[PDB]
Structures are given as structure tokens and as C-alpha cells.
Task: inverse folding
């Protein structure tokens, strides 16, 4: 048999398990999203209203929690393995600064082909869209100087603005669609600087990702 | 009463298919060795379906073997045990299918990952799927004897009350329409969800693959309809109806569904 | 013992070809991707070339496409980069870099302020 | 400035020549008459579940029963290896953790985290509930491994290029050691408790001295990162795992390399390494789901553990030598024997 | 500062009823499964009730079952004992005792002050009740003998020692064997075989005079000892 | 300026390290083999103990 103290210990263990499970049941209501972006590109303005900055918001009775990592070192091939179970990796770039833009694509490629974080679908954003029109209308600088493939590109507001926007979008789309197949995708979403509908877009994209995950997991498709 | 009831109404291959179904369901029934517990929500329903299929195979095996010249020497009470038990058996086969269907539709509608346990309702559903079949098969053992009058009893199975066939076909029609409706709106929901998000690969996989796997509705209905249309035509037809007598073959096809229902739900993994 | 050396730099007139050679030691050279990066005066590190393991899947950056040739030789472990035409803006130090982990296509930290597997670098000057 | 580098290269060449001259014969060839051990088969004696997240660190303690495990769920759990019962489930201030440690006195527990703050929790208290005792801060980098010297000292390693020795009561950094020119991903304390080795992402393992405060010896190799190190029961050798398939055994008295373990069909990486009580098992985890067991004296792999479904984070051999605990990125933690 | 304050005293006519309360303040009340202890005048301790954490299990004494009831309330941090159909023999003083059960823990830690009330198959736990003369500066030993061997298969032996001063509530000295509760000096020791036990006191002081009680915990109906007195 | 100091520190560390005495590899190998053989009769994993002394099961 088992002595009285052992039985009391087993009862305490059962109570601890019950309380732990009940507490962990609330870990599914909140959806976790990581944020990544460039220093010049806006990172705390897309969603209105060492360290780890955290943002909490609520859309249609769904609670979103967003993590932004800052104060660490440049080398980020070791502490990014923790963010393996996040729902999405919001990616914010700048579409009005050509000189640094070639760097941003690299930050999109290394994330896409990484052995971990493979089954996480990013949600692309393109800030400073209003400055792009101003820079295109002015003829002081042209995107052909840095990108030699733009001179022959044709279309698949003014038409020049549309062509530049679609070229910038396709540059990331090609990298997104070349490597990964059937596990994750991208979403350009062509945001603006002072747009107030970003939360709805994030909610819809998270719904689509969750639906795709359920369909794949239940084996329906 | 047996003599007048039979008067009024007027081999290797089947054993092979029964052996096929029983071994096929036994080979996958356990699944204990493989660690399928993270996805156990679907797997325990599958196990339930496998148990129902195994019971159906055993019931058919005893029913076909005992029937024949041996039927007359058998006491009337034991005879019901062959007409009743298999009615439970196949009763646990079709209905449990819907237990799967309504399981999928509920998951694909609310915004939450599959990791949510939802433990209380699933056991209720898996218990009711057995209970409804058990009570449906236990209805005719007491009453509905048809022994009072020679009419109202059919040749599809002797001395059986024809009126019970109406309730059986009503239940089957309800199950069929429910599963057809539940497996139809998942496709519409997937189409509508991809509209706003604008998936560039929606037509490649989200549109072509889904319709391929919603063919289980067709593969189920095209093979379960003949038995019930035969039941309806036997109720409709009256002493000498040539198509009424030849009914031993089509019911075979019914149990043949037991050979195909599990694989289409398991081979995709 | 992961030291990487470079050679072939110096000063050259604007419009002349020039070759740079990176030599590796201490590891199996036929398992890792390789990259060439550059640092201009008063500028950050800019990734400028790439080469995969076998020799195929050669990538490039837009500003030097069609004028730089990158090759790898495995018999004697060597990485070659040849420049045909030069402009005054191409006055920078060049670093030879290796991907962190073998048997992968990530190259996650090729460019960084401080790094372990990266050569000392050589400087090329055009038009003073 | 070139003269300084020329002098450094000359010193490096002199050190290499001295090491080559000191080398006589590799251990992998002298031990040819030793009969190898037979196939080693181990079954999962116990399984502990109910964590709902990925296990990151685990520690046994001076006793062979209790066991502390940490995870990303935000709960640090103390188990019992003989009856699979829980003792404490301590919550955490920060969800992200990377390490845990159990004090030799059996009274304190240490956590880590992606933040810079190392938390020290009390266990024995008058009220009966575990409450945070200390929070050592000011490190500027994520921690990787915490180890206890005694009840009043602790040694920590972080993401930046430093290893610190703290003081619980005062709270300040008593000593700091700088080097490795990169991340530091491992720690282990010698049984003498006077010296300890540290492994970096620079492909370097250094032998730090606690009493003085300066490095004494450095060892290089592995062609890639290092994320697991462990000692030898003698105290004059230690084993190191790497990002590639190789695991190496380094001698301490002579700064050489004794043996390397790797198979031609292994392309994965090593996560944790720990010896046995007699020092002839060198159990090692792997990036893939398995976990191999090597014969330390002769590099002939012997036996395999079934392993979990995701990965093997931490692997620990008890101080009594009769149990092996393996965590995983799925919540289940397995005790083999 | 652990505080346990109890109330509900007075006098009861036979056949009446009453309710006693024990209020706790200082620790976490939701994790401690508390007991009750009853001491008749000039008699040894008795075990009268029990309540566990979460109200999972409730035990009683065979001489009391069917007349009492015990209930704890965490939100108010209060333990209630309602007593109905009293008898002339249930006049005694009541102690409110806490206990926490896990590996390496220690039950029967803090004892309440105590409220007065005036109106088969167990283990013997017998010991010599004769007074043992003492003199400061010498070592003494107190014996305890059981009927059933207390060495369980787990290797533990469940036998506790309690000290009571002439005018203070009892406190726990040695839990199990060779284990000393925190706060007591190192002079006290305990040793013995499976069936015989002995508590040894070395370098005796002036404040150690009192009564010593043996206790067992194997079978859940607990029986305290007669108590050995140290005087002079 | 900082690079010069870093190089000075590296040179000093190398000079200090170069003076450490060493012993033959064969002696270290023999010592490791002798230690591993001496305590080879007390490892529970190397020699499977029966179910009598096994605490887990
Ligand atoms: C709502 C779902 C209901 C599903 C029920 C399935 C129907 C099963 C048909 C019962 C077979 C009737 C008679 C036998 O065939 C008998 N062995 C005489 O055979 P005979 O020797 O005369 O050929």
C-alpha cells in the first residue's frame, strides 16, 4: 500500500496539475506576433496606440500581443530560435529609400530560408508610401540607377507611381515565392504612413493563417 | 409462425470480403504504438469508427453463416439476434461517420488553433453515436413483431415489421442530408476566406485539392444508397414481386463499404 | 584555425580590370557558402557577391551586375572575384566571408560589426 | 600596425610548433587492445508530462531524486524522479527563459531569460510559498547558463563577450572575465571548484580561473559554433559539442586534441553533452530526434536512444549514475535507465 | 509572524451544541491541510478531527464520528468546527494545528494557543510515564515502544516527538527520526530500530523541563503517547 | 586607437600562455585509461544492475 503522506502528496500533485492546466488554458486566447523592421522605417507607427517592447490590442474580441526585441547585439542567429511558435512575423521595410533597400531584401531572404522559422508566414508592409509618389514625380533621382532591371520592366494616380510600386512589391514577392512552397506565403498590403486600418488587415491575415493550419493539420487538404 | 411467415413472403467470395474487412480494420484499430496523441482528436474518432467496423464485420460473419437451412431449426428468439445485432452494427457505421463530419465543421469556423482541447463535447458526441445506434437496434427486439398479422411483414427480412423500415430510411435520409450540408459549406467558407486575404496560390491548392477530398461524400452515398432504395422498393412492392426476393446481393455491397470507409479517412496521413 | 586571407588588391587606373583572391584554411572548403562584402569610407558593410557550394546558383547585387565575375576552386581552396570596369565610387575595403553553419543556404550574419569567420581585408583605390 | 600582427602570428606559430613537438601518439591508437563494451539498450523508465511548451533546461541537484525543469510556458517545475509527482510550480516574471540551476544546498533555484536579469528563488520558507529572493541585473545580454558555486556565489554567462561571478547578498558583480570576441553559450564547473571552462560561438573553449580572474589556456577547433561543454570526472579533460556533427575531447594538462566523434551520415548539430559516472559513455544529444551514445576511450558508437519528436535540448546524468534525464521541444521529459 | 487565534470557548449544558473557529494570518492558508487536537485535563493529547487541502478528504476518530463536522473557508481564512450532541466527557482544551505534506516537508509545525470547553485496531504508542529526575549538566534518554513496526517499505519511519512546557503550547522537536525542526538547538537527538525509539538530550539546560510525547503516523488514526515528565 | 590596445592585450595574453608547461600525450592517455578502468565496476549504466537495486522500476 501507500502511506498517508504519500497519498496526500499525490492529492497535492493532482491539484497542482489541475491549476496549471486551468492557468494554461488562457494561453490560447492571446495570439503572439513578432515585429521586425529597419531603424529608419517606422516600427511603432504601423499599429496605432536587453529589453522587450510589448504591444497589446484587441480586434473583434480577439487579443493580439506583439513583441519587439531591442537592446541586444547585432548577431541574431541564436536568440531568434526562441520565436519558433509565434503566429506571424510582421515585417516592415521602407519603400522611399533606394540606397538601403537592397539591404532589406537580404533580411527577407535569410528569414525565409532559415531551417527554423520555416512554417511561419510573414506579413509584409511597405511604409512611407506617400513619399514614394513625391520622389517618383520629381526627376532628380531614378530607381534605374540602383536597379538595372527597371528600364525594361513594363506594367503586368500616375502610371509611373503604380509601376514603381508594383516593381518594389514584385522584388519581395519573387524571393518569397522562389524558396518555400506550400508551407508559408507573404502579404504586401501596401500600407501608408498614417493609415488606420492596419489592425483589420492583421486580423484577417491571422484568420487565414489559422484556417490554413487547421485544414492542413486535420488532413482535409 | 415461421412457416406461415416464410410462406406468405414466398459462397466463398462473401466470406473472403468479410475476412478482408475484419483484417483491414484490425490492422489499424489499435494505433497505440505510434504517438498520435497530439492529433488524437481526430484519431480517437477514427478508432471509434474502426471499432464499429470490426463489430459490423463480426455481425455480418455470424449472420450470413447462420442463415440458411439452419434458420428453421433455430428458435425464434435467437433469430432476432441476427436481424437485430447487424442493425446495430451498420447502425454504428453510418452514424459514426456523421460524428466525424460535425467534428470538422465546428473546428473550421472559429478563429482558434486545433491545440484547444474541447474535451467535454467530443466524448459526448462519441458516446451518443454509439447510443443512438444501440437504441435503434434495441427498438425492434420488444414489440414490432408483425406476428399478429401476415401482412405488414416483408421478404427483405422475414416477419419484420415493414413500418420500422420507414423510420430507418427517415434516419438515414436525415444523416445523409446533414453530412452533405456540413461537407458543402467548408468549401464555401474556404473560398470566402481567401477572397479578402487574396492568396496568390488559392487556385493551385485551396481550390483544386479541397474538391478532390470532398469526394468522400460521393464515395459514401453512391454505395450506401442502393440498400435503402431497395428497402423502399421492397416496402412499396405484392406477394409475388421478382425484384423483391433477390436482395441478398446488394446488402453485400453495403458491408463492402466497411472495406473502403476507413482507408479514405486514414491513408491521407 | 579558421583564418582567411586575401590578396590581389592595390591601386589601379579607372577602367582597368582587377582580380582578388581569397584563401581559406582549417575547414573543409566544399561544405560552406561564400560571400564577398565591402566597406566604403564612412559607410556600413554592404553585401556585394555570393556563391553556393557546388558552383551553381550564383547571386549578385544590382549595382555590380554584369561586370563582376565570381568563381570558386575546390582543388586548391580559392575564391576569385574579377572586376572588368571600375568607377570612382568603387573605393572600399573588401572582406571574404563564410556562412556560419555547414549544409545550409542561410548566411544569416555575413555582414556584422564584429564577426568571427571573416578576413582582415584588402583595399582597392581608383582615381585616388 | 602590421608589426603587431606579425608578432602575434610569430607567437601563434611558436605555440603551434610547441604543441606539435609535445605530441607523441594519439589516444585513438594506443587503446587498441581494450575490449569494446557491448550494445547498450535503454528503455524509457519514466515519462513526465503536463508542461504545454518546449523544455529548455533541466538540472538534477546534489540528490538523485529531485529535478528542476524550465520552459517557455512561463512555469519552472520541480519533479520527483521516483513517483512522477510535482513539488513546486514556480511562476516567472518573464515568459522567455533559457537556463535553470539547482543549488547544491537544495534551498535555492536560479533562472535565466532572454532579458538580462538572473532571478534567484527561495524554496525553504516559513510561510510555505516560494517567493523571489534576488534579481541580479546589469549585464546587457541574454543569459545562457547559470551555475552555483555555493549558497553565496553564482557564475553566469551571457550573450555578450563576458562571464561574470556575482555575490547574492551584495548583488554586485564581484568579478568579470572578458574575451571570446563573441557569444558565450556554455558553462561547467570543475569538481575542484577553482577553475571552470567556457565555450563561445568563436569556436573557442577557454579555462577561466575563479580565484585570479584571468584566462589561462585556450583551445580551438570545431570549424564552427560551440553550444555544449562538459567536464571529465578526473578533472583533467573535457568534452565539447559543436554545430557540425563532431564532438571533441580536449586534454587539460597538455593543450591538445585527443579524439573526435562524427559519422559520415550525420549532418545535424549537437545540443548537449554530459559524461557518465565512470566517464565511459559521453552521452550526446543531436539536432535530429535521436541521441547517440559514444564509447569515450574508443570512438565506436554503441547503442542509440529512441528520442522525442522535435529535438533534444538538455541531457543530464545524475550524480549517482543510475539515471539519464532528457528534455525536448515537446513538453514530455523522459527518464532512462 | 505566523498567527493562529482560536475562539468559541465557554460552558455547555449536556445535549447542546457549539461552534469553534480558528483564524490564521501570516502564511498562505490555501495550501495547508490543518488538523485539530484535543487535550483532556491532566491527560495526554488526542486526535479528534482533520481537514485536507481543497477539501478532498476528511477523516475522523471512531469515538467521535457522527457528531462533529469540520469545514475550512479560504476566502475568509477561517477553520470551523461545529459540535452537536455533546457528552459529559468531551470537556477539554482544543489546539489548531497546521501541516503541509510533500517530499522533504514537515507536518505539525505551529500550534495554536488553545480554547477551553467545560461541560480495537489502533497502535498502542505506550511509554513509561514515570518521572525522570534531572540535573543541569547531564545527558538523559527517553524511550518509546510501539506494537507494529513503523519502518515502511519506502525506508521512512513515521514517529514524531513533541515537547510541551508547563505553560506554553506544544512545539515539534524531531519529525521522523534524526531530523530536527528549524529553530531548535543541536543538543536533541533521536535514534532507534524499527520497534524501539529513544530521544537523547545532552548538555541539559534550565528551560528544557516539560513533558515529551511520542507519536506515529502509519495508520491514519493517530495515537499520542502517555507523556514523560522531566522535573528538577 | 582601440585596435592598438586590443592587439597589445592579445600579444600579452599569447606571451603569458606560451609559458605554460606541458606533458607527453601518452602519459595523459595512460592516465585517462587507468582512471576509466579503475572505476569501471561502479557505473550502473555500463553494468546493468538487476531489478532488486533498481529504484525506478
Ligand atoms: C439506419 C441504418 C440502418 C442500417 C441497417 C442495415 C440493413 C441490414 C439488412 C438485414 C438483412 C436481412 C436478412 C438477412 O439477409 C438474413 N440472413 C436472411 O438471409 P436468406 O438466408 O433469406 O438469404
Result:
Amino acid at each position: 500500500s501507500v502511506s498517508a503522506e504519500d497519498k496526500a502528496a499525490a492529492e497535492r500533485s493532482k491539484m497542482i496539475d489541475k491549476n496549471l492546466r486551468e492557468d494554461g488554458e488562457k494561453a490560447r486566447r492571446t495570439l503572439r506576433l513578432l515585429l521586425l523592421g529597419a531603424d529608419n522605417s517606422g516600427k511603432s507607427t504601423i499599429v496605432k496606440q536587453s529589453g522587450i517592447f510589448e504591444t497589446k490590442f484587441q480586434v473583434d474580441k480577439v487579443n493580439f500581443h506583439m513583441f519587439d526585441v531591442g537592446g541586444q547585439r547585432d548577431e541574431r542567429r541564436k536568440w531568434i530560435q526562441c520565436f519558433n511558435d509565434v503566429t506571424a512575423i510582421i515585417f516592415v521595410v521602407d519603400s522611399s529609400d533606394y540606397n538601403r533597400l537592397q539591404e532589406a531584401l537580404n533580411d527577407f531572404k535569410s528569414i525565409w530560408n532559415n531551417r527554423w522559422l520555416r512554417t511561419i508566414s510573414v506579413i509584409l508592409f511597405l511604409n512611407k508610401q506617400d513619399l514614394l509618389a513625391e520622389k517618383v514625380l520629381a526627376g532628380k533621382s531614378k530607381i534605374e540607377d540602383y536597379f538595372p532591371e527597371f528600364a525594361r520592366y513594363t506594367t503586368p494616380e500616375d502610371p509611373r507611381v503604380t509601376r514603381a510600386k508594383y516593381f518594389i512589391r514584385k522584388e519581395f514577392v519573387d524571393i518569397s515565392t522562389a524558396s518555400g512552397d506550400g508551407r508559408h506565403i507573404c502579404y504586401p498590403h501596401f500600407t501608408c504612413a498614417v493609415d488606420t486600418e492596419n489592425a483589420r488587415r492583421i486580423f484577417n491575415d491571422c484568420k487565414d493563417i489559422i484556417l490554413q493550419m487547421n485544414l492542413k493539420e486535420y488532413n482535409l487538404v | 409462425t415461421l412457416r406461415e411467415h416464410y410462406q406468405y413472403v414466398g459462397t466463398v467470395l462473401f466470406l473472403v470480403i468479410c475476412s478482408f474487412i475484419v483484417l483491414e480494420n484490425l490492422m489499424v484499430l489499435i494505433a497505440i504504438w505510434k504517438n498520435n496523441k497530439f492529433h488524437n482528436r481526430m484519431y480517437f474518432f477514427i478508432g471509434n469508427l474502426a471499432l464499429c467496423d470490426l463489430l459490423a464485420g463480426i455481425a455480418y460473419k455470424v449472420n450470413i453463416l447462420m442463415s440458411g437451412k439452419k434458420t428453421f431449426s433455430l428458435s425464434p428468439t435467437v433469430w432476432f439476434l441476427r436481424e437485430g445485432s447487424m442493425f446495430v452494427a451498420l447502425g454504428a457505421s453510418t452514424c459514426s461517420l456523421l460524428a466525424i463530419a460535425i467534428e470538422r465543421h465546428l473546428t473550421m469556423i472559429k478563429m482558434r488553433p486545433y491545440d484547444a482541447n474541447k474535451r467535454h463535447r467530443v466524448f459526448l458526441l462519441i458516446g451518443m453515436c454509439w447510443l443512438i445506434a444501440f437504441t435503434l437496434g434495441a427498438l425492434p427486439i420488444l414489440g414490432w413483431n408483425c406476428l399478429h398479422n401476415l401482412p405488414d411483414c416483408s421478404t427483405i427480412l422475414p416477419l419484420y415489421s415493414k413500418k420500422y423500415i420507414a423510420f430507418c430510411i427517415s434516419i438515414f435520409t436525415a444523416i445523409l442530408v446533414t453530412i452533405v450540408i456540413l461537407y458543402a459549406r467548408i468549401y464555401f467558407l474556404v473560398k470566402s476566406s481567401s477572397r479578402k486575404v487574396a492568396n496568390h496560390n488559392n487556385s493551385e491548392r485551396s481550390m483544386a485539392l479541397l474538391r478532390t477530398v470532398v469526394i468522400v461524400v460521393s464515395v459514401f452515398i453512391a454505395c450506401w444508397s442502393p440498400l435503402f432504395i431497395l428497402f423502399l422498393i421492397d416496402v412499396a412492392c405484392v406477394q409475388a414481386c421478382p425484384i423483391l426476393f433477390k436482395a441478398q446481393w446488394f446488402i453485400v455491397l453495403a458491408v463492402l463499404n466497411s472495406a473502403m470507409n476507413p482507408v479514405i479517412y486514414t491513408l491521407a496521413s | 584555425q579558421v583564418q582567411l586571407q586575401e590578396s590581389g588588391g592595390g591601386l589601379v587606373q579607372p577602367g582597368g580590370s582587377l582580380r582578388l583572391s581569397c584563401a581559406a584554411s582549417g575547414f573543409t572548403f566544399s561544405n560552406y557558402k561564400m560571400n564577398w562584402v565591402r566597406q566604403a569610407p564612412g559607410k556600413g558593410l554592404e553585401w556585394v557577391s555570393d556563391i553556393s557550394q557546388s558552383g551553381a546558383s550564383i547571386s549578385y547585387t544590382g549595382s555590380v551586375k554584369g561586370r563582376f565575375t565570381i568563381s570558386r576552386d575546390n582543388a586548391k581552396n580559392t575564391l576569385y572575384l574579377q572586376m572588368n570596369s571600375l568607377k570612382p565610387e568603387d573605393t572600399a575595403v573588401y572582406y571574404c566571408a563564410r556562412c556560419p553553419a555547414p549544409f545550409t543556404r542561410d548566411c544569416f550574419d555575413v555582414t556584422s560589426t564584429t564577426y568571427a569567420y571573416r578576413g582582415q581585408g584588402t583595399q582597392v583605390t581608383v582615381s585616388s | 600596425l602590421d608589426q603587431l600582427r606579425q608578432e602575434a602570428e610569430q607567437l601563434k606559430n611558436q605555440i603551434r610548433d610547441a604543441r606539435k613537438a609535445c605530441a607523441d601518439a594519439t589516444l585513438s591508437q594506443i587503446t587498441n587492445n581494450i575490449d569494446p563494451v557491448g550494445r547498450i539498450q535503454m528503455r524509457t523508465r519514466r515519462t513526465l508530462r503536463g508542461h504545454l511548451a518546449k523544455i529548455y533546461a533541466m538540472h538534477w541537484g546534489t540528490d538523485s531524486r529531485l529535478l528542476v525543469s524550465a520552459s517557455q510556458d512561463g512555469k519552472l517545475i520541480i519533479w520527483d524522479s521516483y513517483t512522477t509527482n510535482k513539488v513546486h510550480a514556480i511562476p516567472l516574471r518573464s515568459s522567455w527563459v533559457m537556463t535553470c540551476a539547482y543549488a547544491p544546498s537544495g534551498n535555492y533555484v536560479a533562472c535565466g531569460g532572454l532579458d538580462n536579469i538572473c532571478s534567484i528563488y527561495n524554496l525553504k520558507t516559513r510561510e510555505g510559498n516560494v517567493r523571489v529572493s534576488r534579481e541580479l541585473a546589469g549585464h546587457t545580454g541574454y543569459l545562457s547558463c547559470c551555475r552555483f558555486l555555493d549558497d553565496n556565489q553564482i557564475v553566469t554567462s551571457s550573450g555578450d563577450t563576458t562571464c561574470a561571478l556575482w555575490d547574492i547578498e551584495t548583488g554586485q558583480q564581484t568579478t568579470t572575465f572578458t574575451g571570446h570576441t563573441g557569444d558565450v553559450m556554455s558553462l561547467s564547473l570543475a569538481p575542484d571548484t577553482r577553475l571552470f571552462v567556457s565555450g563561445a560561438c568563436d569556436a573557442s573553449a577557454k579555462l577561466w580561473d575563479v580565484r585570479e580572474g584571468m584566462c589561462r589556456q585556450t583551445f580551438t577547433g570545431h570549424e564552427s559554433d560551440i553550444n555544449a561543454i562538459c567536464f571529465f570526472p578526473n578533472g583533467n579533460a573535457f568534452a565539447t559539442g559543436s554545430d557540425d556533427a563532431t564532438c571533441r575531447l580536449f586534454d587539460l594538462r597538455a593543450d591538445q586534441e585527443l579524439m573526435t566523434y562524427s559519422h559520415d551520415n550525420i549532418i545535424c548539430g549537437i545540443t548537449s553533452v554530459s559524461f557518465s559516472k565512470s566517464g565511459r559513455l559521453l552521452l550526446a544529444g543531436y539536432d535530429d530526434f535521436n541521441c547517440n551514445v559514444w564509447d569515450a576511450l574508443k570512438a565506436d558508437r554503441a547503442g542509440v536512444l529512441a528520442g522525442h519528436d522535435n529535438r533534444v535540448s538538455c541531457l543530464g546524468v545524475t550524480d549517482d549514475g543510475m539515471a539519464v534525464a532528457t528534455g525536448s521541444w515537446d513538453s514530455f521529459l523522459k527518464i532512462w535507465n | 509572524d505566523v498567527q493562529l487565534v482560536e475562539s468559541g470557548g465557554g460552558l455547555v449544558q449536556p445535549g447542546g451544541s457549539r461552534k469553534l473557529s480558528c483564524s490564521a494570518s501570516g502564511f498562505a492558508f490555501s495550501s495547508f491541510g490543518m488538523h485539530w487536537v484535543r487535550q483532556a485535563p491532566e491527560k495526554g493529547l488526542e486526535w479528534v478531527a482533520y481537514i485536507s487541502s481543497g477539501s478532498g478528504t476528511i477523516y475522523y476518530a471512531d469515538t467521535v464520528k457522527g457528531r462533529f463536522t469540520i469545514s475550512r473557508d479560504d476566502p475568509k481564512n477561517t477553520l470551523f468546527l461545529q459540535m452537536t450532541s455533546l457528552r459529559s466527557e468531551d470537556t477539554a482544551m482544543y489546539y489548531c494545528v497546521r501541516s503541509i505534506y510533500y517530499y522533504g516537508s514537515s507536518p505539525f509545525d505551529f500550534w495554536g494557543q488553545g480554547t477551553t470547553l467545560t461541560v480495537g485496531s489502533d497502535i498502542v504508542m505506550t511509554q513509561a510515564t514515570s518521572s525522570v529526575p534531572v540535573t543541569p549538566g547531564e545527558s538523559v534518554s527517553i524511550s518509546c515502544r510501539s506494537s507494529k513496526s513503523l519502518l515502511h517499505s519506502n525506508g521512512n519511519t513515521y514517529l514524531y516527538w513533541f515537547l510541551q512546557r508547563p505553560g506554553q503550547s506544544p512545539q515539534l522537536l524531531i519529525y521522523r527520526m534524526s531530523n530536527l525542526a528549524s529553530g531548535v538547538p543541536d543538543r536533541f537527538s533521536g535514534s532507534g530500530s524499527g520497534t524501539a525509539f529513544t530521544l537523547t538530550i545532552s548538555r541539559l539546560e534550565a528551560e528544557d523541563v516539560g513533558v515529551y510525547y511520542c507519536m506515529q503516523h502509519l495508520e491514519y488514526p493517530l495515537t499520542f503517547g502517555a507523556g514523560t515528565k522531566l522535573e528538577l | 586607437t582601440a585596435s592598438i590596445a586590443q592587439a597589445r592585450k592579445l600579444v600579452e595574453q599569447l606571451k603569458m600562455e606560451a609559458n605554460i608547461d606541458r606533458i607527453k600525450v601518452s602519459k595523459a592517455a595512460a592516465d585517462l585509461m587507468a582512471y576509466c578502468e579503475a572505476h569501471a565496476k561502479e557505473d550502473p549504466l555500463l553494468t546493468p544492475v538487476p531489478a532488486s537495486e533498481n529504484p525506478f522500476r
Remarks:
- Strands of chain A lie at 30-37, 51-59, 62-70, 88-94, 122-127.
- Chain A touches chain D at residues 6, 9-10, 12-13, 16-17, 19-21, 24, 27, 50-52, 69, 71-73, 75, 78-79, 82, 84-85 (CB under 8 Å).
- The longest helix of chain A spans residues 4-24.
- The domain at 30-217 of chain A is CATH 3.40.50.300 (Rossmann fold).
